[PDB]
């Protein structure tokens, strides 16, 4: 339906431009609250970044 | 510094399940650099699209 079509187009922005538009962000945030595995996944992505950054000089 | 900014954003995600702008930056860089994470994000959206297109009356 029309809402599914809008989600499909948001998927294309991610696929073609590597940008997460607002509607996609909110879906991803809902997923953080409804999927313990994905919640862990996202924490892992950020943890990878943090651990490297914490021990950096600059 | 980048480390403690990331750490604070991880806590926001854990507590509230919303993604601060500074964490979104990191997430976008990850999906631009990591084919599997890019597809994992698409899978989240694909499920939302599929659900939005559920059988329904009009």
Residue numbers in the entry:
A (entry chain B): -3 to 0, 210 to 263
B (entry chain A): -2 to 0, 210 to 264
Sentences from the paper on this structure:
C. elegans SAS-6 physically interacts with SAS-5, a protein that shuttles rapidly between the cytoplasm and centrioles throughout the cell cycle. Overall, these findings led us to conclude that the segment between residues 125–265 contains two independently folded domains and encompasses all structured elements of SAS-5.
The SAS-5 Implico domain comprises a novel type of protein dimer. We found that this newly recognized domain is highly conserved amongst Caenorhabditis species. Structural and biophysical analysis suggests that SAS-5 can form tight dimers through its Implico domain, a novel dimerization interface with no known homologs outside SAS-5 proteins. We envision that SAS-5 would readily dimerize even at low concentrations via the Implico domain, as oligomerization of this domain is tighter compared to that of the SAS-5 coiled coil. As anticipated, coiled coil disruptions in either SAS-52–265 L141E or L141E/M167E mutants yielded a stable dimer in SEC-MALS experiments, mediated by the Implico domain. Furthermore, we found that a SAS-52–265 I247E mutant, where the Implico domain is disrupted, displayed a single-step thermal unfolding profile as measured by CD with a Tm similar to that of the SAS-5 coiled coil in isolation (compare Figure 5A). Our work shows that formation of these tight SAS-5 dimers through the Implico domain is necessary for SAS-5 localization to centrioles.
